[PDB]
From TrEMBL:
Active site: 310 (proton donor)
One of the record's GO cellular component terms: membrane
Protein family: Belongs to the glycosyl hydrolase 20 family.
InterPro entries hit by this protein: Beta_hexosaminidase_sua/sub (IPR025705), FA58C (IPR000421), Fn3_assoc_repeat (IPR026876), Galactose-bd-like_sf (IPR008979), GH (IPR017853), Glyco_hydro_20_cat (IPR015883), Hex-like_dom2 (IPR029018), HEX_bac_N (IPR015882)
Organism: Bacteroides thetaiotaomicron
Phosphoprotein is among the record's keywords: no
Record's protein name: beta-N-acetylhexosaminidase
GO molecular function, one term: beta-N-acetylhexosaminidase activity
Binding site for Cu(2+): 259, 278, 319, 322
Amino acid sequence: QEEANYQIIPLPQEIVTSQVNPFILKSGVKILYPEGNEKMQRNAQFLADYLKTATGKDFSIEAGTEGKNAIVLALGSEVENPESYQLKVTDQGVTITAPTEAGVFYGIQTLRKSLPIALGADVALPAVEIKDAPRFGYRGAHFDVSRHFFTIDEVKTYIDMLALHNMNRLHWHITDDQGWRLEIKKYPKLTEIGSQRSGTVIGRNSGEYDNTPYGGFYTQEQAKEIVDYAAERYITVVPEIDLPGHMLAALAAYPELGCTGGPYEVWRQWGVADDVLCAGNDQVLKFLEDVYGELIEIFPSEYIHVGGDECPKVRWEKCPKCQARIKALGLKSDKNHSKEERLQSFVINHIEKFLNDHGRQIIGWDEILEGGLAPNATVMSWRGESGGIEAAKQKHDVIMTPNTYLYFDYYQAKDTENEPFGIGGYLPMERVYSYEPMPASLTPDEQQYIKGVQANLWTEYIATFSHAQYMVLPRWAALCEVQWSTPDKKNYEDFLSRLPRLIKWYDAEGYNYAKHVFDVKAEFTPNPADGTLDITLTTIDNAPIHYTLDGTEPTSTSPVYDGALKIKENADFSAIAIRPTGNSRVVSEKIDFSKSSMKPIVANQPVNKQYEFKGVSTLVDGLKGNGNYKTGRWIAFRGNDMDVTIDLKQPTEISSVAISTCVEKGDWVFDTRGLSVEVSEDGTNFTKVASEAYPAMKETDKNGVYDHKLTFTPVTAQYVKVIASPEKSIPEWHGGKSYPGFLFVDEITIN
Ligand SMILES: CC(=O)N[C@@H]1[C@@H](O)[C@H](O)[C@@H](CO)O[C@H]1O
Ligand SMILES: [Ca+2]
Ligand SMILES: [Cu+2]
């Protein structure tokens, strides 16, 4: 028999539990909703759908206030927070009570996420009282459907994914330079021409082009379908028709809207286009009024996103019409703004006034601060937090989407080679979760202007919905705890222990996701005291870890990890986590163990401060490095030799010393010019037993790892001094001729 678990994502405010019998969830149980409430009937059908993917069973939906062996949805308690709820469980029944139908829905999402996926099985719901409410009223995700186009069905899946994470906003970015995606009745060419490009660039603007005509748009009926589908799941769809930049698709369709007058093409490549709407053209203002006039008939959202990001002023500076507008308005350059930044403020003010007259407010990207903020504008801070902080100080509402924390087109792993191709950056789960949306630099009163938190998905490098899921799951799980949970409840270790129960729902709903959190985490800790390299292995779900030391594939039949592996000998280490769902990536490490490994070592000359890492002890930990000299497997020397003494602890017969170096000549990192081995009985007086000089490197020599080994007549020694020269004088062919080069070394092996 299965048991429910209320330790879910996002973590509720208040969870109690008692020593009373649980509620058994078997065939016969009913869901009750208030007579004649369409939303609460839809809430009941949602619970039934969820209970059907969790248990294998159907549960009847019926009108009612009262029932034995029943789950009762009802309205009640305070309206302080409209999205709050109360989930009480006894052996007799289940109550989900909220001040609105949306609060009942988030109460239902909590019951949903508490359940395991166990087909054919009855489930025990332990006796509990859950009081919960979101911290932020605006909890959103953005979706770029211009750069690559996504179908109605894919956008609905995105909306189902929002609901599972208690998010109440879809920011729908439906126009840009590379495609216009909404049918407009007055301007048919916005879709006939504006929705089509000749092809798409390959890689990061590489000059190679995929000459496949690419396009797609939504009809006004299809866009209404999305509004309605989102509205059932208590999600407001905030549309963005980005202006006055990111408008090449509109210019291709109607070139008179641009400063030069064309020619313009729908853009095949990525980045920022200089060709923007002409602020000096009365046709452009009429055009925006007409487009936004049609937009607000489709999208009832009180808030409408006008964009305002990355609008270069270069065309405006040279345009006689834009300069005539500037002259007539008396716009001036001062320390706060250029004339052309004041001209942008005029455009944002014009569309705000039109939308305020039709009962709507505007959101803009933090660039709308340029030339003075529109008096009623909400600011979406994306260029870090600083735009939001300045907006809050001017008493304007802020939605935080900082690219330092919440740009989910960025890589979510350091090892970008093994990731799907992306724009760049590094936003791992831990970084996303560490985000505190309320800046420490704002006064309490200024903090009330932080209304929302949202993560953006730009799709320059996202062509499939499966890859879009990979990029947002499970990073949305971290985001939604930030959006929802109180800041004092946040603990990263605890969140990661809750994540696997949410991934089970990703699996059951057929959602793709990144699997980095499921990896075996390996720590290699030197133990000088014991003369061992201690390997510790962990998973977030504490799944069974199987390992090999002999270089064979680790399987379900290999030895099981029981506690620290104390390595005292050569080893091809490999470990894997065994999971019903599918096995983890294999974590592996070559352990090069010798007479030097975990022995005391001293620097006789200085280690380079910049590339010191864990220090000289790095050269006797049994670990080797690769071509990348920045990992901490390598320590560097510059302006003096690697000159170290290793204490073998007692007199010992030795016959060889081996090192590796890391070469990157472009970075002034060169191979050693000579290696030497001296021995002592007393630790003061050393005698040379072997050496070799290496010639200066030539232009055609490879970068990467070089191996250097000296053999010699067996000799008895307690102390071994190993000396390696860097390049004191970089050779003539190289730009740094005569300057000293870096030397990087990873390990001193002695046998
Ligand atoms: C407000 C904003 O972010 N604008 C652009 C966006 O078109 C682009 O896709 C993204 C890259 O991550 O960032 C900026 O270049
Ligand atoms: Ca090492
Ligand atoms: Cu112009």
